[PDB]
Design an enzyme around this catalytic site. Structure first.
Site, PDB file in Angstrom:
ATOM      1  N   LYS B  89       0.900  -1.164   0.060  1.00 28.85           N
ATOM      2  CA  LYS B  89       0.003   0.218  -0.201  1.00 28.85           C
ATOM      3  C   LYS B  89       0.736   1.130   0.109  1.00 28.85           C
ATOM      4  CE  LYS B  89      -3.907   2.012   0.511  1.00 28.85           C
ATOM      5  NZ  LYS B  89      -3.883   2.617  -0.687  1.00 28.85           N
ATOM      6  N   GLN B 110       6.848   4.361   4.175  1.00 26.63           N
ATOM      7  CA  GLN B 110       5.528   3.967   4.209  1.00 26.63           C
ATOM      8  C   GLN B 110       5.021   2.902   4.852  1.00 26.63           C
ATOM      9  OE1 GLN B 110       3.101   5.879   2.009  1.00 26.63           O
ATOM     10  NE2 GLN B 110       1.681   4.867   3.439  1.00 26.63           N
ATOM     11  N   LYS B 125       5.476   2.228  -2.813  1.00 29.18           N
ATOM     12  CA  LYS B 125       5.623   3.643  -3.373  1.00 29.18           C
ATOM     13  C   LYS B 125       5.633   3.614  -4.707  1.00 29.18           C
ATOM     14  CE  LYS B 125       4.689   7.722  -2.084  1.00 29.18           C
ATOM     15  NZ  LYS B 125       4.338   8.342  -0.694  1.00 29.18           N
ATOM     16  N   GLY B 164      -3.043   8.260  -4.397  1.00 33.84           N
ATOM     17  CA  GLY B 164      -2.821   9.427  -5.006  1.00 33.84           C
ATOM     18  C   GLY B 164      -1.464  10.100  -4.242  1.00 33.84           C
ATOM     19  N   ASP B 165      -0.758  11.082  -4.554  1.00 32.42           N
ATOM     20  CA  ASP B 165       0.337  11.891  -3.956  1.00 32.42           C
ATOM     21  C   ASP B 165       0.473  13.008  -5.117  1.00 32.42           C
ATOM     22  OD1 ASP B 165       3.353  12.118  -3.133  1.00 32.42           O
ATOM     23  OD2 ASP B 165       2.480  10.430  -1.813  1.00 32.42           O
ATOM     24  N   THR B 209      -7.800  13.745   7.940  1.00 31.67           N
ATOM     25  CA  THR B 209      -6.330  14.128   8.744  1.00 31.67           C
ATOM     26  C   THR B 209      -6.677  15.168   9.769  1.00 31.67           C
ATOM     27  OG1 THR B 209      -5.446  13.840   6.481  1.00 31.67           O
ATOM     28  CG2 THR B 209      -4.102  14.651   8.298  1.00 31.67           C
ATOM     29  N   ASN B 240      -7.147  21.989   3.795  1.00 31.97           N
ATOM     30  CA  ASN B 240      -7.755  21.008   4.320  1.00 31.97           C
ATOM     31  C   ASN B 240      -7.362  20.410   5.479  1.00 31.97           C
ATOM     32  OD1 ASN B 240      -9.689  18.600   3.434  1.00 31.97           O
ATOM     33  ND2 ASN B 240      -7.870  17.695   3.843  1.00 31.97           N
ATOM     34  N   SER B 380      -7.891   5.688   4.134  1.00 31.39           N
ATOM     35  CA  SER B 380      -7.957   4.811   2.916  1.00 31.39           C
ATOM     36  C   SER B 380      -8.166   3.029   3.230  1.00 31.39           C
ATOM     37  CB  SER B 380      -6.716   4.916   2.352  1.00 31.39           C
ATOM     38  OG  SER B 380      -5.758   4.843   3.068  1.00 31.39           O
TER      39      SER B 380
END
Lengths: 449, 449, 449, 449
Positions: B89, B110, B125, B164-165, B209, B240, B380
């Site tokens: 992931k 990650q 990644k 996404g990133d 977040t 955000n 996620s």
């Protein structure tokens, strides 16, 4: 039953060389007479005949290297007995005694017990003649990898989900899992149950059996317009099952007043209901002392060497230890005391003599270990669900479902017995309920399997 | 740790041309000695040596046509770092700067981060050196399609789930997904996360977040025998994250007093606590002006051009914008005001130096961004669970889960550091906890991977 | 070519850390302008830009245990460069020096070379940084097994067929193969080449390179209105290649007059033409002494310590041993004797300088090793055909095929150079021919790859 | 051999329950001491221990519906014994006596037999306890379909290629094939051998065994500096095998002078060397009269009711009918006639006592049926080849190949026996050559299988 009888005979002849399997078939079918008799349609599609032949048998070579570079070869087995109601499911046994007959009988029983749980689980069994005794960690590791290198292609989360058994524990499971993951190149962790928490194992595993047993007793109580609160219980053992049972009873208002080790047994009239008392149980298992007396020492209670708690006057009899712990003469004492509830926990804790005995008794409630101890199986199904959902349930969530399904188990058994006019026969009901769900699925499924 | 030191040494030598990867390794492992020191078994099986090498790396050619019919070629990557605890992931980044060093460094982290969430997720990644800026929608579509034409074979719901990133958002995710389902010829919507709600995305994505950060804090309070009630907070950014943070703090009874933009900072002592105030943040973000000043001109409050709010006096510090936002300079300002709560939210909003500095601070509670901003990741995982269950959870259900998990994260971090004899060190806590689970898993899984 | 120049430029910039790969690209493309100059269509579709980037690259972790139970970790690679004309094909190298740069550089060449054989074979290269020297047989077995456990998923008879190389021989190929068939659960023996005859290897393997070289030459003679009859040859080395070359030249009526070893050279003016002489080469190779002198002491002939035979006077020069064997020095010696036939056999037995030098030589016929030693490769393709047909060809059939193909190779090279207006330039011929087929194929196949 | 001895004893204790298998192992193994003795490395890798355990065994349930709608159940088996040298290969038998022991012993023999042919074929055996006796064509069709519904998953062109045997002929093969092709959704006709020509069967199937035996004799002749020209041959039977032998014999210049039936024998001193006489055999086979006398009656030759032809003075003896045709008594007759060539054609047509005995005669040549009768196996291998090539070979091409391979079988047999100092012992040579190719492949393949 004519059909039943006929089928048994055929099996006797055809599999004369698989004695364990043969015995198991007799015993099982013998007791379905009524159900069958009530279902003439079964015979027309050769239902029983199909049932006694596994859907698929797999045997394979397992060559492996020991620590000295010495090469050994063992045989692997995987018997996929019945998959009408769910993926094949069942443990792996690593023992020198392993053979097809043993795998067949074990796998046949497995389908029945799994059916009973109410969960979608088929029945299988597997293993190897490999003898883990005396092998190094590394050697076990090497064997496990070799084993899985072939096995992997026959199983999977939606096909066949193995688990441990004699010789196969968390360690082997982990070793097989690593190999699997590597070969297949994905996670698919629900391919196996009994896993460590780090890679998907479930909470409440240890307590599962003891707890489940209590929840079952509760459904019995309810059935009988009675209750757990205030009840006295006589346990056997001081092991894991006994411990889970003790804890859960206390929590519910009841109380365990006996325990038993090789040495004899203790009698605690205040009940094994305190934090200290209950954990002290953990203490002793650990110690290795196989001494039920450590409790009597620690706590200042009655110790009875060379004795069995079966003479004690309680409300509930709950053997959680050894096989054939309740013999003809032990049972006699129990009946002399007029105890009404006989709940088997451990596997085959009662002799047949004993069993037929208590069995006559018109006043008593007898519950079969196969339905009673199903908590262990249930938690493995939960593990499967959690793995599919991609999250872990909390211990409260697990406990909850456990309580709930165990209730379904008791109830389903009772309704079945009643349906075939046997009354409130829990022993028979268990047999009938597992069988029936299987029969129903097979019937709806047509002649493919 | 000598082991650690040594392993670190080898990496430096061997991957000298992978500067980024080298640092990260360095930084992460140096921080684990005590864990390693107490786990002698790790060495015997070359644990760290295996961990530093990705399970699998994939690179591939990506040819694509532009709106003019001119052909371009880029390279795609996918590093599948560690899958011991779940399927791989990690997000996908499309930036001209993309190279294996970078992919490896992000992939390595990650995994630790993913481990710490408590969910069954591995680390990976990927991305491309493709540069989306300046490209038409159609070109972006064409690129995603080409990219997936090869990638598809390496990923999957039970294998590897990307997200996404930088450079990869909803639009891209949608295009990639359309290509995937067309190729595979099924749904398998859990193959990717960050999807629109119409084809499987989760509720609560945006708030995620921001909200988890607060829930994290809440757990800090509790630890500290304290409360969120009437506390003031200094936020950095107006995006955000800041927005979700502000919203929730406010519902919790605390208050955000600073915002920050590229053009300076604002001061609003009443606190950014009204619907109108809070919703303004979204208009601001939406305008794309990148001027924190519009809040000030709108609500009539203090506005400090060229300045960071790191000098205002508050109870809690929460950098939610950028990298190395906080420095020794700004560090001092903070300590000086004797503020005790320093909560990184944004990714690495602090200089390693400012970092040490803060830690030395005997009164302060320092919390790491990787633990704190974990809400985006949790969400996620929930998206994956919902896709697996074939239903959508309600915002209330998502939120509640988010809430329980964040707490566990904080709690787990605390006992980890607690176990190492480092006390309430949430920074090491976050490291130790993430590592430990991976180690336990790899240990149980044997030498396969 | 500007296109070419430019593309070359980009590669240098982009892959600066891949020195080896960069050179190779440089060297190969610089040599193609005229082809490119006449194929304007290539540019429009970014042909070279795609060619320089491998279709797919794979790297993976390889953990393995040693005879002591100590664990090691290495990295495995597999670069699948171009598959436009056949499945990927290329050997595997196990050497401590292995890295992506090297793999890429070998893989890139592998494709051109493979294209030139006229068979349907793509280009690839793989290997590991594992170092087999010093390892026991069992450790080598363990390593191969681990290596294949991951690799298997990326290769196959119709996908990618690897072979041996530095560090990888029959032994290794056997181990890899045993693991592959066990995992996949089928035969698929065409997955690898260089296998023992017992499980699918071809006849004529050893003779292969040696023989094809001669057949190549034979085609040169013919072109030149000449003959092999009564020619003398200067060979370098005494290994399998030299041996096959000598054998066949002799059957063809010509004669080898030099051999060479690390310890100097030998002179045998009668020519190495007898069974006894020829078979001696095998005893020599077998002894492992690496002393060319034993021939001299055996047969009583001239022996020149510290010297290369590049100074003897012959009709034909055939370096069959090492790299940069021939230099300007030795170049001069040759030209000086006005010898007209310079046939590289070994891989790059000449310095680029010696190379130019020779080419300037208006009377000489210079032939490239990649075209000339192609017999080893042809034979592996034949091995594939035989595995596909499920039968074995006779040595006579192999040989005849070998023979017709080598001729086509020479002939095709000649008309290629012929078409470019470069005349009988077999060096450019070999380049142009290999490239052209790939280009035609990629052109017809569109922008997918 | 001590190893061999040791292995045999273990199998005896271990597989007591599979007498037929136990029996074959002892017989095969006991005849291999010298190769074994010469190969101490075999024992180090537990080679024999591995060879005695099939790679994989599959048993499965087979439910099927008869014409009257009644449901039946049988057991299906597939023993994939050894696949070191090719895909598993072996026939299917449908008989009521089929069981595992039976399947194992036959599959074990099959490996050695297939090895010996020189073609790339592994060894396997399968079938079912189904009794084709009395089943309509439709029921047979239904059974075949049910059978293949589960079997299909374990076989395939590169995996396991079954063929006919007792109870399985072209009709069954065709039904199984239709079902396979349907499930898999493709052609893959090479999954089964013995197919009809309409969908991939080979020319020359019927003649194969008969012709091949003659080719083998021709090889003996040449080894002995003799010829077939002018020889008289005594044949047993009048079936397909005898028919092909007779026809080929005539072609090559020799002549069959006897035929036999259960009724006695015929003597045709003039030779069964005419189209009329040869074809008559065909009519005799069909008639269903099962009488050899018919030929005597037809052609006016001598008929000897109740006798065998073993007292006739001829050059070559070739039993082409029943097992145990030649007993000690008949053998004495032959020895007594000073006949040099005794060629077994049918399976095991000589008693153990008789074999031994003939084997003691120094002036004699004794050839085992296992090698002589291989023509049948060969043409099945050729079927696989043509199917892979997607074309049909002419009858000449087939015959030509059969011819060549047969010679190779003899020569390879001869070479092996002699390599172990047994001289021209075709009986042991067959054993050694089969085993040898397998041992070699397994050694090269490592400890996987």
């Amino acid at each position: 039953s004519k059909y039943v009888d006929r089928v048994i005979a055929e099996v006797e002849k055809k599999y004369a060389d698989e004695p364990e399997f043969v015995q198991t078939v007799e015993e099982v079918l013998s007791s379905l007479g009524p159900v069958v008799d009530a279902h003439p349609e079964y015979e027309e599609v050769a239902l029983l005949e199909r049932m006694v032949i596994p859907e698929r048998v797999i045997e394979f070579r397992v060559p492996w290297e020991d620590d000295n570079g010495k090469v050994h070869v063992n045989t692997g087995y995987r018997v996929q007995f019945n998959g009408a109601i769910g993926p094949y499911k069942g443990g792996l046994r690593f023992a020198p005694s392993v053979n097809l007959s043993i795998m067949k009988f074990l796998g046949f029983e497995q389908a029945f017990k799994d059916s009973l749980t109410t969960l979608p689980m088929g029945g299988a069994k597997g293993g190897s003649d490999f003898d883990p005794n005396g092998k190094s960690d590394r050697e076990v590791m090497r064997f496990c990898q070799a084993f899985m290198t072939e096995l992997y292609r026959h199983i999977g989360p939606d096909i066949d989900v193995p688990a441990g058994d004699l010789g196969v524990g968390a360690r082997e499971i982990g070793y097989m899992y690593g190999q699997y993951r590597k070969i297949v190149g994905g996670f698919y962790n629900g391919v196996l149950t009994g896993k460590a928490r780090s890679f998907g194992g479930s909470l409440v595993r240890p307590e599962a059996t003891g707890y489940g047993s209590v929840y079952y007793v509760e459904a019995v109580m309810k059935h009988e317009n009675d209750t757990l609160v205030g009840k006295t219980v006589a346990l056997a053992g001081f092991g894991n099952v006994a411990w889970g049972a003790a804890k859960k009873l206390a929590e519910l208002g009841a109380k365990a007043v006996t325990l038993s080790g090789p040495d004899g047994y203790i009698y605690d009239p205040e009940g094994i209901t305190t934090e200290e008392k209950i954990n002290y149980m953990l203490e002793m298992r650990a110690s290795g002392r196989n001494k039920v007396q450590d409790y009597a020492d620690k706590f200042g209670v009655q110790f009875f060497p060379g004795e069995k708690p079966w003479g004690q006057k309680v409300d509930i009899i709950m053997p959680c230890a050894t096989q054939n712990d309740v013999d003809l003469e032990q049972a006699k004492k129990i009946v002399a005391n007029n105890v009404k509830y006989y709940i088997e926990v451990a596997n085959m804790p009662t002799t047949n003599e004993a069993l037929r005995f208590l069995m006559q008794q018109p006043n008593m409630v007898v519950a079969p270990s196969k339905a009673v101890n199903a908590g262990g199986v249930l938690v493995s199904g939960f593990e499967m669900s959690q793995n599919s959902e991609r999250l872990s349930w909390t211990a409260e969530e697990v406990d909850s479902k456990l309580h709930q399904v165990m209730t379904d188990i008791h109830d389903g058994s009772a309704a079945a017995a009643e349906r075939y006019g046997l009354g409130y026969n829990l022993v028979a009901g268990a047999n009938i309920v597992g069988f029936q769900k299987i029969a129903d699925a097979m019937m709806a499924q047509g002649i493919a399997w």
